[model samples]
Target: VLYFIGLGLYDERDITVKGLEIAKKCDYVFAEFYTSLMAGTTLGRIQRLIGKEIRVLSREDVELNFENIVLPLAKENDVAFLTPGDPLVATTHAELRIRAKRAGVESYVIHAPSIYSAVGITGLHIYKFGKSATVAYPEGNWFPTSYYDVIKENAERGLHTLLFLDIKAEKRMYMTANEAMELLLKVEDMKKGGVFTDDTLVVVLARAGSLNPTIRAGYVKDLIREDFGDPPHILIVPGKLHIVEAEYLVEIAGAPREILRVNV
Candidate 1:
């Protein structure tokens, strides 16, 4: 049997009971860590809490040759395949399941909260968020404004934009709130969107699954100085704010009352 578990957004405690149960019983457990790195939780800490030694697999292990490593192991005995975010979000996991079934290897998926779902907890109506983009840092001299275009379009339609930041390989690098804010400023300058400015209401969400997660809202320029503390950070560019949205921004995201220019 194959057990696919989701290690939710932040730390060890983020895992669901169902995932914990399966992880503890499994003789062989493997995790994929490349999609997004989890902060405030170490692999060692996770092992200690669940009392299971987990083998970390690279992208090649699952996306490239899943059957060679994952399926064959499950054929012998129950094995657990864990992932940050929901394990099944990656097409490779589902493809592996079908292949396992064809090969007569039974499979089970243990679901947990993913960042995609976690975004709703921020009090931003999920449907109000339009198309999303992962803002990647430019190579030495290259600049990409595609994400800027997406955000601008969302604003034109009065929809919020969820901007996912980039993640480098095993070498850890999280695009900080300040860095992202600056990038947006450059994009705004280039496009002259007027939609993005020093006073634009921006939300910085850091360590979404960890205890005491950080969520801050303010003018983009004001946010450019503060540190968001670790990998797996994201930014939200909101459209015109409603009164309720303004209130939630203050109460939930720590936006200053003076910054509620749109609704007031």
Candidate 2:
């Protein structure tokens, strides 16, 4: 049997009790952290708790050869394939299970809190959020602006855009909201869509899932260079604001009161 147990948020202790027990019972434990890195914990701590050495895989390994490397192990041994957050949500309808079935390996999933849960922290209405996108770090000649288009489409429909910052785990780099905003601004210049600019109203959630998170809502001009603290920040391009939501932003995220009159 193969168990894809999800580790919640940024810590080892955040894993579900059931998932922990099942992982401990497994003979072989493996993990794929390239999708999402648990910033607050280390491999040694989790290894000590689960009593198994976790073999980590890269993107190429997981995306190309998961069946070759992982599925065969499950044929003879109970294997636990741990992933950050809810595996399905992180990988987005991942075909890993389909391949497992093809290899005749039975697999099961255990859910956990995703970074999308950061939406609740913004005090924004979940129903109002539309298409989600990721701001990626461009390399060489392959710059991508699809995320900017997502924001534009969502904004045109009067729905909020959830922008997930890029995560380059292998490089040990997590793109911050400031960098993401800069990229969007550059995209705005390239496309001239007026999708993102200094004047745009945005919400930023930094170090979410921690006790004292940095939740700030303001204009891109003000926040573009402003430091929100560590990595793993989520940027939101809200289309319109509800009165209640606006008030919560002012009271909680310290959003400027003028937003109530400007956009509301």
Candidate 3:
């Protein structure tokens, strides 16, 4: 059997009891961190807890060669493939199950806490979120602007937008909330649609799933210069806010009191 286990956000302790037990019993364990990373945890700690040596797989290995490397082992032995957040949340791991099926290997998925639900820490109504997008780094002569348009479209519908920042794990490049804001600003300058600007209200969540994540909300001008302290940060571009939501951001997320009048 091939098991896909989700290591919850932040740390090793975030794994569910069932996932831990199943992972420990597996004959081989593999993990990938390119989708999302547990910034607060180390591989050594996770290996020690599971009592197994985890073979880390890169994007190419999983996307192109998972059937060759992982499924063959699953055919004869129990195997566990781990991912940073809920296994299939932001990845194509679901297709891996299809590969397993073709390879005559039974596969099971173990769920865990993911940033999709963890965004509630910002005190925004979960139902208010419309579409989510990721901020990616631009390559020479190939800047991606679709994500900026997503935020713009969501904002027009009076729905909140959740932005997942990019991370190049092999290069150890993690996009910060500040950098994301800057990119949006540049996009706005080019698009000239005013989707994002210095006066725009935004929220920053850093090191989520930890005891004390850095949650802050304010205008883009202020946030672009503020330090959110560490990698794996997410940004929120809120739409029309409910009164209670505005109050919660003010009290819980350290948002400016002016947001109650301006953003709401």
lDDT winner = 3
lDDT scores for all predictions? 0.82, 0.86, 0.92
lDDT of 3 by residue, 57-167 (tens): 999999999998898899999999999979988778899999899888999999999998899999999999998999999979898888999998999999999999999
Model 2 stretches with alpha carbons more than 4 Å out: 262-264
Write one digit per residue (lDDT tens) for candidate 2, span 1-264.
898888877778878999999999999998988777677788898888888999988888888888889988999999999887778874742698888888898999988778786578899998999989988899999998999999999999989998888898988999999999899999999999988988999999887766777899999999999999886788999988888888888999888898777442
- Would you estimate the TM-scores of all the predictions? 0.88, 0.95, 0.98
lDDT of 1: 0.82
Candidate 3 structure, TM-score to reference: 0.98
- Full ranking by TM-score: 3, 2, 1
**Per-residue C-alpha lDDT of model 1 across residues 1-264, encoded as one tens digit per residue:** 988888888888778998998789888988888877788788899998789888888888777778888788788887998888887753347777888889898888888778776777677788899988778889989987798888888999999899888777566777776788888898887889786789888888888887777888888767889877776788899877777777887898888886556643
Residue 79 of model 3 has an lDDT of: 97
* Top-TM-score structure, candidate number: 3
Greater TM-score among 1 and 2 belongs to: 2
